């Protein structure tokens, strides 16, 4: 897995990567990918997340101190945060 | 000994734009390394 | 003089919802064709 | 069509004289019955929708 | 009497092992199989590939669409004719 | 040198009728040789990578001992042809785009 | 939600915004009410629009048009008309009075009729019709 | 019935709002500031989002969230009356939520 | 034509059109003669 | 400016709003708002108060009959009481 | 039991802590938390208390000579004072 930018505890970075990869393996469309990646992590840790999946998107977003993750898998991109 | 606030969160702002698929921070799209990476994937028998 | 009475507090946090969508060149093309069609409908 | 486009009793009377009139035009020349039943049922439905509206 | 005659012709050639028609969401109607423990396999696996491929083709230039598709495995040629009403499958080893 | 051989294969394929394009993309969705510009390249690489891993998982799930050496999607404009060779130390799903209308 | 409701919604939106503004202004609305006979105040119509205007425009549009038709329609197909035919005047009792049918055939003045229908739609074989066998009649 | 991408780009200059829960003055100000952002920097889109949410940050709300792009997907939780999704230039599209 | 352009237009009519409903009464005069007229030719 | 529940004199609810809102714009954190307003509001009207400010709140508190405000202002609501 | 700040006797603090927590567990709504936390602790010691429950609020309070409590427990914020 490829990570370009993150500022958060690595012990749940492993949680993020194992949450995203089985999602990407299972479903076959990219709306339900951003559905699941929020949904299951939302029932895991916190009340609030936001998650983007696609290619060639631009964004500015206020960070969270220990919740900001920018994945990269197989020319398919994921962002999620609080 | 008499005042209170909740545990306040902290937030600044960060950016991200996605371009391409090189392995890691070994390589960067806005540089020359792409050429040499394709070179070391071009000459294997 | 004046006595003591008590009240409570009902705080409504602003309403929230969830929106999910997928932007792709096919979606965009179809919508513009629709926006153009209503233009002809308005014109006619 | 009259099912599609249905003081109240004046209007209901007028509707039903109109239905009588359809049959009178027929006179100058069994499903008769069932058409007439669904018509009257629909008119009563109009009346009870109104009656719940005033609540 | 043209649809069923074409089904009967197409199911009797030298390699064909099954013809399937499936609706929009599912419900494989008019299979051709002597048991139905693997029809449902086709019906819920393949139209994901058909509409995923319509995504791949159409994304490029939106005047474009998809019409057919073939997947040739080692021992099978899964040909799918996808379109708006349904998805259709014909299986054949050459 | 074999680099002349593979470039020669590109002119072998590309000398055929109607063949608009040839490109090679590896398992990490990054193109290696091209024939297109750079952005149609990267969008093919991403799209076809995801699509072909879904299709191979489909065929392997459907039957345990059967894999695919072939893939062919159709347009009304151009018949994209994907070939993969799933192996270790190499899995290079080359993809051609062609159509018999032109010329 | 359906496809012909969009047709009637477009026709009625054409009827209201009659000049062609693309937005329901108050004057065309009062024109529609005055064609229907009503000439209310210029403060109640404000409140009516302000409940229907969501965007702050003081003018309602097709999205708001179908929003109000959607809420009023689907909040409150063949169940009601066949139901309220005669048995829906009885409200889940299954016993219809013969005198209602005699009155119906009385008022509409029909030339020849024999009521053997109710004699030969009798499925409980008592002399009345429950609702399921009532649909079986229909 | 135009017959390429290019005649589509000749027609497609409008900025249709795909879906939006915003006040009309809210809508016009946000819509125009986003079109000025997209026309200002077509190449580098990161600093388009810089400009969009930092203007909305100082003026309208303390939290804001802008996403511009070419092809993507999203699922967000957003407080109501503050969501903008528009198609700009017949290709580029922008999600915007607080 | 003479026996089934009538009897597939006599069954195509619409009697009631779109208080003041007395106009309907007047309206239902008119088409009455219609069917009567058509019927005579078929007879 | 919206008030919800109150029984004070209208002149001092106007005084309360004009004390509170410009103080809200003056500061940026909201411990010190609820020090500054109550100290000022001691020195202006009457010799003892308590105030709370903030978001997502619940409370149960005793107000002398002629002293109670429930602001709902900038979606940072204030409640203040004797 | 996380206590940030107080100046007050300590077995009454024990009553504070348990009459906060079992009140939180018995109840399930935002207002009734501070309803119980007053009412019980009210009728036990003294007729005058004031109590606050929620998250992301804020207040200064004048120092109560011997009776002041603040909690922080399981993303629930509670204040008590005389």
Author numbering:
A (entry chain K), J (entry chain L), K (entry chain M): 8 to 89
B (entry chain E): 60 to 104
C (entry chain D): 178 to 221
D (entry chain C): 878 to 883, 914 to 936, 955 to 980
E (entry chain J): 2 to 95
F (entry chain I): 2 to 104
G (entry chain G): 15 to 90, 97 to 158
H (entry chain P): 5 to 102
Sentences reproduced from the published study:
Dyneins are a eukaryotic family of ATP-dependent microtubule motor. They are categorized by their two major roles inside cells; cytoplasmic dyneins travel along microtubules and are responsible for both intracellular and intraflagellar transport, whereas axonemal dyneins are docked onto doublet microtubules inside cilia and power ciliary beating. The ODA has a single large dynein motor that repeats every 24 nm and influences the frequency of ciliary waveforms. Here, we report a single-particle cryo-EM reconstruction of three-headed axonemal dynein natively bound to doublet microtubules.
This core is expanded by an additional heavy chain (α-HC) appended to the tail of β-HC and the calcium-responsive light chain LC4 bound to the tail of γ-HC. All three heavy chains are connected to each other through their N-terminal tail domains. The tails of β-HC and γ-HC are architecturally similar to the tails of cytoplasmic dyneins, consisting of an N-terminal dimerization domain (NDD) and a series of α-helical bundles connected in a zig-zag configuration. In contrast, the α-HC attaches to the outside of helical bundle 6 of β-HC through an N-terminal, kelch-type six-stranded β-propeller that is located 170 Å away from the NDD of β-HC and γ-HC. The conformations of the β- and γ-HC tails are supported by a “block” of intermediate and light chains that resembles a similar subcomplex found in cytoplasmic dyneins. This block contains two intermediate chains (IC1 and IC2), each with a β-propeller domain that interacts with both β- and γ-HC.
